[PDB]
Write an enzyme that holds these catalytic residues in place. Structure first.
Site, PDB file in Angstrom:
ATOM      1  CB  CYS B 127      -1.019  -0.014   0.878  1.00  0.00           C
ATOM      2  SG  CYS B 127      -0.342  -1.261   2.888  1.00  0.00           S
ATOM      3  CG  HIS B 251      -0.631   3.917   4.446  1.00  0.00           C
ATOM      4  ND1 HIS B 251      -1.603   3.627   5.529  1.00  0.00           N
ATOM      5  CD2 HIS B 251      -0.269   2.612   4.560  1.00  0.00           C
ATOM      6  CE1 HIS B 251      -1.686   2.179   6.077  1.00  0.00           C
ATOM      7  NE2 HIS B 251      -1.000   1.560   5.132  1.00  0.00           N
TER       8      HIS B 251
HETATM    9  N1  LIG Z   1      -4.997  -2.909   5.295  1.00  0.00           N
HETATM   10  C1  LIG Z   1      -4.326  -2.657   3.448  1.00  0.00           C
HETATM   11  O1  LIG Z   1      -3.664  -1.752   3.845  1.00  0.00           O
HETATM   12  C2  LIG Z   1      -3.366  -3.241   2.561  1.00  0.00           C
HETATM   13  C3  LIG Z   1      -1.947  -3.013   2.438  1.00  0.00           C
HETATM   14  C4  LIG Z   1      -1.424  -4.064   1.184  1.00  0.00           C
HETATM   15  C5  LIG Z   1      -1.786  -5.111   1.472  1.00  0.00           C
HETATM   16  N2  LIG Z   1      -2.418  -5.638   2.512  1.00  0.00           N
HETATM   17  C6  LIG Z   1      -3.164  -7.480   2.546  1.00  0.00           C
HETATM   18  O2  LIG Z   1      -3.830  -8.195   2.717  1.00  0.00           O
HETATM   19  C7  LIG Z   1      -4.367  -8.546   2.856  1.00  0.00           C
HETATM   20  C8  LIG Z   1      -5.568  -8.651   3.507  1.00  0.00           C
HETATM   21  O3  LIG Z   1      -5.551  -8.113   4.379  1.00  0.00           O
HETATM   22  P1  LIG Z   1      -5.667  -7.098   5.519  1.00  0.00           P
HETATM   23  O4  LIG Z   1      -5.660  -6.414   6.376  1.00  0.00           O
HETATM   24  O5  LIG Z   1      -7.720  -7.704   4.865  1.00  0.00           O
HETATM   25  O6  LIG Z   1      -6.352  -8.377   6.576  1.00  0.00           O
HETATM   26  P2  LIG Z   1      -7.476  -9.194   7.972  1.00  0.00           P
HETATM   27  O7  LIG Z   1      -8.663  -8.072   7.923  1.00  0.00           O
HETATM   28  O8  LIG Z   1      -6.875  -8.988   9.147  1.00  0.00           O
HETATM   29  O9  LIG Z   1      -8.393 -10.401   7.138  1.00  0.00           O
HETATM   30  C9  LIG Z   1      -7.643 -11.335   7.119  1.00  0.00           C
HETATM   31  C10 LIG Z   1      -9.093 -12.415   6.225  1.00  0.00           C
HETATM   32  O10 LIG Z   1      -7.876 -14.044   5.601  1.00  0.00           O
HETATM   33  C11 LIG Z   1      -8.666 -14.461   5.855  1.00  0.00           C
HETATM   34  N3  LIG Z   1      -8.262 -15.452   6.536  1.00  0.00           N
HETATM   35  C12 LIG Z   1      -7.203 -15.903   7.224  1.00  0.00           C
HETATM   36  N4  LIG Z   1      -6.905 -17.319   7.223  1.00  0.00           N
HETATM   37  C13 LIG Z   1      -7.012 -17.543   6.289  1.00  0.00           C
HETATM   38  C14 LIG Z   1      -7.197 -19.062   5.703  1.00  0.00           C
HETATM   39  N5  LIG Z   1      -6.183 -20.270   6.105  1.00  0.00           N
HETATM   40  N6  LIG Z   1      -8.238 -19.430   4.319  1.00  0.00           N
HETATM   41  C15 LIG Z   1      -8.400 -18.381   3.612  1.00  0.00           C
HETATM   42  N7  LIG Z   1      -8.248 -17.030   4.425  1.00  0.00           N
HETATM   43  C16 LIG Z   1      -7.493 -17.001   5.906  1.00  0.00           C
HETATM   44  C17 LIG Z   1      -9.376 -13.778   7.241  1.00  0.00           C
HETATM   45  O11 LIG Z   1     -10.980 -15.194   7.233  1.00  0.00           O
HETATM   46  P3  LIG Z   1     -11.776 -15.097   8.638  1.00  0.00           P
HETATM   47  O12 LIG Z   1     -12.553 -14.188   8.364  1.00  0.00           O
HETATM   48  O13 LIG Z   1     -12.321 -16.167   7.992  1.00  0.00           O
HETATM   49  O14 LIG Z   1     -10.423 -15.045   9.445  1.00  0.00           O
HETATM   50  C18 LIG Z   1      -9.899 -12.893   6.721  1.00  0.00           C
HETATM   51  O15 LIG Z   1     -10.508 -12.410   6.235  1.00  0.00           O
HETATM   52  C19 LIG Z   1      -2.692  -8.596   3.888  1.00  0.00           C
HETATM   53  O16 LIG Z   1      -1.881  -9.979   2.794  1.00  0.00           O
HETATM   54  C20 LIG Z   1      -2.210  -7.885   3.424  1.00  0.00           C
HETATM   55  O17 LIG Z   1      -0.720  -7.585   4.243  1.00  0.00           O
HETATM   56  C21 LIG Z   1      -2.970  -4.935   3.229  1.00  0.00           C
END
Ligand SMILES: NC(=O)c1ccc[n+]([C@@H]2O[C@H](COP(=O)([O-])OP(=O)(O)OC[C@H]3O[C@@H](n4cnc5c(N)ncnc54)[C@H](OP(=O)(O)O)[C@@H]3O)[C@@H](O)[C@H]2O)c1
Ligand SMILES: NC(=O)c1ccc[n+]([C@@H]2O[C@H](COP(=O)([O-])OP(=O)(O)OC[C@H]3O[C@@H](n4cnc5c(N)ncnc54)[C@H](OP(=O)(O)O)[C@@H]3O)[C@@H](O)[C@H]2O)c1
Lengths: 357, 357
Positions: B127, B251
């Site tokens: 991001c 950010h």
């Molecule tokens: N947030 C940002 O600004 C941003 C920016 C650039 C890249 N990212 C990337 O985006 C990804 C997710 O970010 P987030 O901030 O949204 O995280 P988050 O809110 O913690 O959400 C995690 C998601 O992953 C799912 N998950 C976890 N374990 C899993 C599994 N074994 N199989 C299938 N689904 C699973 C969770 O499902 P449940 O509800 O069932 O646990 C939930 O839907 C990460 O890789 C992060 O590095 C984020």
């Protein structure tokens, strides 16, 4: 002992001035608290003793030995010259006298020598500058300093007591009433004197003080000009970006330097650790680094995240945190006063060099 | 139309992926929501339709044309290769595949050309990197880029839903219950996987992701490596300091660059304004600059505080803000999918180039 006046005793810095003086070695025979007309009559503690606050005027300084000013640049411009005329030595926290060549701009660990030639006013630098000077002086001493680039992460208490209260209530409105941050009403931040005000809750405001004509703010230009005066070196290139964030107390700084000679990182860490007023908090294997919430209440300046630039041979990055009301203000001022005492420099100035207004 | 799967539909990015897909031009015949076993069987909306959440498995991708992954690196490592085998085109919002030479790392406004040669996975950059690339590409095109120094001011939603809730509750404990920031119990930030956790309330944590063996964090090294890949230029020097602050979304970055040729500031402002996805918010006479709270909910990246370095001829400072869940993740991902559709690139890859785990 001395008669000591705290001018601005009711404000954010003034409250910490009281604490630092209570904990000081300065021999104090009499303490006086001064503020505006609307604070006169109110009582405030010094240790277990009750002190009546007095209105600051042109005639309020007779018999005072040391006056610590922390009441806005305007109050210092108006009354500090009258204090000097009355035989006081003034230690001033405001920006007003900082760039006057008759006024030493002092961080005691860095340039205490500048006190010797004072003319009745000593200026304390800007908070963000002071902590940067504490971190960087030990490096400059051994390897020199060619340039600094700094991005700051400044707490709201730097803007006064009102700014703290505005921040807390904005956050409560968002978290308790569900107000969108962008719908919040602001009165003070980013700068009380400027035309427009913006929310700080869940925000990062890239404006501290007002804008100058070169599109840097006065805060950013203070870091530049004050660094050069404190280090008595105009060849040090300094550029800053000063940002307010939702932290109540303690400023943090991402600091990039280029030294004159290559400075091995382990030696840099050791030099900073050994420098008075600087504490090394740097152990990334155990996630140790300076943090604002840990720095609150300490007189020390904490340095970590120390690492060489990925490309510039002489480039070094670090992270610097200090309590803006302590080393950034009240502690720096009290340290100056203690140094003046130690050096026999608390006495009237014969020649008045500052205009009475 | 397409069958589209959102992997990680329940998370902070996932919720925005839904919103962006609902507002997308993409012809969608069928939506599937995938997550972990924890959410399987629960229901979320796509427009007025109730959609049952499915557990993600190696066999869940039959009939899917496009899968948007935002469920953590481990989930992408495990399942994305099986999706590609099943004939899917994967748009991946994790770090896992970003540096694989068979994977385009794409910001559509900068390097959409890289999509043409995709092998079934397109990676969305970090991001903080995406918003910097939108701001800097228009400058690179006209004057070149020699180096970048960036210090970030990153929102907690970058660390997921749990980190948002952790921040809100910490702030509520301080503001409503009178808990000191230092006495707060943290469980997630700075980094959920690392050994120690620290409060973010009224704090600034100079750690995002875990530390690498050069004492920069993985977040800082991603900004370095991803920049070089996106701009197809390993000679660009990039060093970063990445800091979490108490902002829920959006950010902000203090960005310093040195161009190859002198870039007049008024022309830099014009070039950024004219660049798709970048909006100039820069009028210091009326205190106009990008703010996190203003960027929230917008797909644009906002740039201001643009000004030359005080000493370095080719140096320029700026302030870049974007919604980390939109352009930083879900919008960049949906924009990639729209671009794939426009270019006739939504189709199975014959040859599997990714290891099955
Ligand atoms: N947030 C940002 O600004 C941003 C920016 C650039 C890249 N990212 C990337 O985006 C990804 C997710 O970010 P987030 O901030 O949204 O995280 P988050 O809110 O913690 O959400 C995690 C998601 O992953 C799912 N998950 C976890 N374990 C899993 C599994 N074994 N199989 C299938 N689904 C699973 C969770 O499902 P449940 O509800 O069932 O646990 C939930 O839907 C990460 O890789 C992060 O590095 C984020
Ligand atoms: N805050 C920091 O971290 C920091 C750091 C370095 C330097 N400084 C400097 O310290 C100074 C004080 O800042 P602060 O943050 O403590 O502000 P603050 O909390 O708003 O307090 C202002 C103080 O100034 C007094 N005052 C205002 N007008 C006065 C007048 N006409 N005559 C006498 N007293 C007057 C007020 O007295 P009443 O209560 O009677 O109005 C109050 O005691 C400023 O110049 C600031 O630039 C602050």
């Amino acid at each position: 002992g001395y008669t000591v006046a705290v001018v601005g005793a009711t404000g954010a810095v003034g409250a910490q001035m009281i604490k630092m003086l209570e904990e000081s070695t300065l021999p104090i025979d009499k303490i006086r608290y001064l503020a505006s007309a609307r604070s006169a009559g109110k009582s405030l503690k010094f240790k277990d003793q009750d002190i009546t606050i007095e209105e600051t005027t042109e005639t309020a300084f007779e018999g005072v030995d040391i006056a610590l000013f922390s009441a806005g640049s305007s109050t210092s411009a108006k009354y500090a010259p009258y204090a000097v005329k009355a035989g006081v030595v003034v230690v001033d926290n405001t920006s007003y006298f900082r760039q006057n060549p008759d006024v030493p701009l002092v961080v005691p660990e860095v340039n205490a020598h500048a006190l010797d030639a004072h003319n009745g006013i000593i200026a304390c630098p800007n908070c963000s500058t002071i902590q940067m000077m504490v971190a960087l002086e030990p490096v400059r001493q051994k390897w020199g300093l060619d340039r600094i680039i700094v991005s700051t992460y400044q707490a709201v208490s730097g803007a006064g007591m009102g700014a703290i209260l505005e921040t807390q209530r904005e956050l409560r409105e968002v978290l308790n009433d569900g107000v969108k941050p962008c719908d919040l009403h602001a009165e003070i931040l980013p700068s009380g004197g400027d035309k427009k005000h913006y929310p700080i809750a869940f925000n990062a405001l890239p404006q501290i003080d007002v804008f100058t004509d070169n599109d840097y703010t006065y805060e950013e230009m203070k870091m530049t000009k004050e660094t050069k005066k404190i280090m008595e070196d105009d060849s040090i290139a300094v550029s800053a970006t000063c940002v307010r964030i939702p932290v109540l107390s303690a400023h943090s700084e991402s600091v990039y330097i280029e030294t004159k000679e290559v400075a091995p990182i382990e030696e840099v860490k050791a030099a900073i650790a050994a420098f008075p007023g600087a504490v090394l908090e740097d152990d990334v294997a155990h996630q140790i680094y300076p943090q604002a919430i840990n720095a609150v209440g300490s007189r020390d300046t904490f340095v970590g995240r120390i690492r060489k630039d990925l490309d510039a041979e002489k480039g070094i990055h670090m992270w610097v945190v200090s309590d803006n009301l302590l080393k950034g203000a009240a502690w720096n001022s009290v340290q100056i006063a203690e140094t003046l005492h130690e050096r026999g420099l608390v006495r009237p100035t014969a020649e008045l060099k500052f205009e009475l207004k």
